[PDB]
Amino acid sequence: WNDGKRYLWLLSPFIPVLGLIGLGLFLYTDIGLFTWSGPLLIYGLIPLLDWLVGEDRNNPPEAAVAQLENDRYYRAIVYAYLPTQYAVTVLGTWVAVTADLAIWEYIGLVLSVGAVNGIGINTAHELGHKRENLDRWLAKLTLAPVAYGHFFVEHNRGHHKNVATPEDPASSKMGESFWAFLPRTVIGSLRSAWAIEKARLQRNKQSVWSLDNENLQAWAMTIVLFGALTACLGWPALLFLVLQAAYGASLLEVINYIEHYGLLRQKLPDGRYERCQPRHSWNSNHIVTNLFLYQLQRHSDHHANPTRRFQALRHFDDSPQLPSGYASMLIPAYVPWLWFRLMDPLVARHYGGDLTKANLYPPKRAALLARWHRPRYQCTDCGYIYDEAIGCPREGFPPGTPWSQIPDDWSCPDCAVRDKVDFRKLPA
Ligand SMILES: CCCCCCCCCCCC
Ligand SMILES: [Fe+3]
Numbered sequence: 278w279n280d281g282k283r284y285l286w287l288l289s290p291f292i293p294v295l296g297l298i299g300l301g302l303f304l305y306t307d308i309g310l311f312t313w314s315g316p317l318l319i320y321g322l323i324p325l326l327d328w329l330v331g332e333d334r335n336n337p338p339e340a341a342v343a344q345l346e347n348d349r350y351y352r353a354i355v356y357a358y359l360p361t362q363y364a365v366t367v368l369g370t371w372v373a374v375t376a377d378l379a380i381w382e383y384i385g386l387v388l389s390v391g392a393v394n395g396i397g398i399n400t401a402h403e404l405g406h407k408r409e410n411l412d413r414w415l416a417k418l419t420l421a422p423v424a425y426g427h428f429f430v431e432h433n434r435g436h437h438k439n440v441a442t443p444e445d446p447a448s449s450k451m452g453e454s455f456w457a458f459l460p461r462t463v464i465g466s467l468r469s470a471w472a473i474e475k476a477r478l479q480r481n482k483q484s485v486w487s488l489d490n491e492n493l494q495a496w497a498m499t500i501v502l503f504g505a506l507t508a509c510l511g512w513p514a515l516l517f518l519v520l521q522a523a524y525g526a527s528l529l530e531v532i533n534y535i536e537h538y539g540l541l542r543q544k545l546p547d548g549r550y551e552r553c554q555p556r557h558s559w560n561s562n563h564i565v566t567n568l569f570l571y572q573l574q575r576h577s578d579h580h581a582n583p584t585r586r587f588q589a590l591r592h593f594d595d596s597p598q599l600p601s602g603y604a605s606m607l608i609p610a611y612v613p614w615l616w617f618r619l620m621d622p623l624v625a626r627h628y629g630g631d632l633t634k635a636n637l638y639p640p641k642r643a644a645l646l647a648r649w650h651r652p653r654y655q656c657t658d659c660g661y662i663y664d665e666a667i668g669c670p671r672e673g674f675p676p677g678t679p680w681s682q683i684p685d686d687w688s689c690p691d692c693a694v695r696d697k698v699d700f701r702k703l704p705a
């Protein structure tokens with residue numbers, strides 16, 4: 278079974294090359310428009326190829342899935358992204374602090390570098406799920422230029438666990454404007470990351486202000502990079518880096534807004550939420566954007582099986598579908614009323630006119646209800662095996678720890694989507 282779209286994945290590592298070409302053209306021909314090579318590319322060009330080329334509801338055969346995850350080329354693709362984002366950042370900073378510029382082209386440079394680092398954040402997300410030790414460090418390195426390093430902890434252990442619940446500071450509520458959502462998600466991510474790492478360290482009988490704190494390990498790389506650039510160039514370099522990092526963080530947060538807008542997970546008869554399923558996240562199958570990003574828009578199979586590699590994701594008929602691709606709907610997300618008009622009918626239709634099973638904004642509940650309501654152990658998902666003789670030293674359990682001493686709320690440390698009570702006791 279020939280994959281077909283094998284070499285077409287190369288567009289994903291090609292975006293930083295596009296930014297580099299734009300910077301080179303600006304430096305050579307001295308034309309201002311070439312600075313805006315990022316905003317134009319991700320606002321007018323991509324949501325034009327997305328219109329030209331339609332859907333694709335295709336899945337790999339089950340037999341071929343075994344060998345798709347053992348191909349080194351699909352990992353070389355992701356690895357190739359790294360040694361061009363740093364080049365783009367360095368060149369952009371040098372140009373912004375050295376060459377004479379007007380205000381608007383300075384803004385264009387900021388936006389271009391920020392966009393490159395936002396797709397860098399996407400690559401970091403793709404890298405941080407793999408259980409290989411080297412990939413975690415590579416993801417931490419990738420998150421450095423955008424200065425948002427706590428993502429590696431938060432996404433892996435507080436978002437994938439609290440999907441589509443009124444507690445997660447990463448799931449939208451229907452009726453909530455984006456600008457009323459950005460501070461909430463940013464602050465909640467900070468607090469949750471700090472709390473998670475402090476809890477783990479305290480369980481390990483060690484102070485939070487230690488070199489083992491992964492948040493500090495992630496932020497040290499950003500501190501080092503920014504300090505080196507500032508020492509080489511000066512304060513304007515620091516200002517430019519701060520602005521571009523802010524824009525990249527905004528780019529990540531708008532996608533977080535889009536993914537799970539309005540959905541909700543139903544409580545089990547006992548006091549816990551049901552396991553995450555493909556019907557708890559929006560999905561789309563637009564070819565061009567799924568090529569420029571690493572199969573990102575299929576945020577159902579990944580977000581219910583957070584170990585399948587990006588080349589083996591599937592399409593599920595039960596999931597809700599977006600009107601278009603992600604890049605197609607970024608302008609109709611900064612504008613609140615337009616986004617509401619586009620989305621609210623779709624949510625109501627998906628829930629069959631019964632909006633008592635939706636994540637409703639508390640201040641706007643009554644209006645929406647008036648307008649729309651017309652009625653040895655193993656993990657069963659990722660295969661991780663816990664052995665009493667080996668134990669889990671990272672989580673604070675020394676070797677020789679009987680299964681009874683594990684807390685009931687403990688979750689699988691490869692996927693964090695199954696609790697202790699969901700494991701299966703393997704036979705001797
Ligand atoms: C939850 C996965 C994070 C995805 C990060 C992508 C952010 C950049 C997307 C830009 C699309 C135009
Ligand atoms: Fe998500």
Ligand SMILES: [Fe+3]
Pocket residue numbers: 402406432437579580583
């Ligand atoms: Fe993920």
Ligand SMILES: [Fe+3]
Pocket residue numbers: 656657658659660661689690691692693694695
């Ligand atoms: Fe697991």
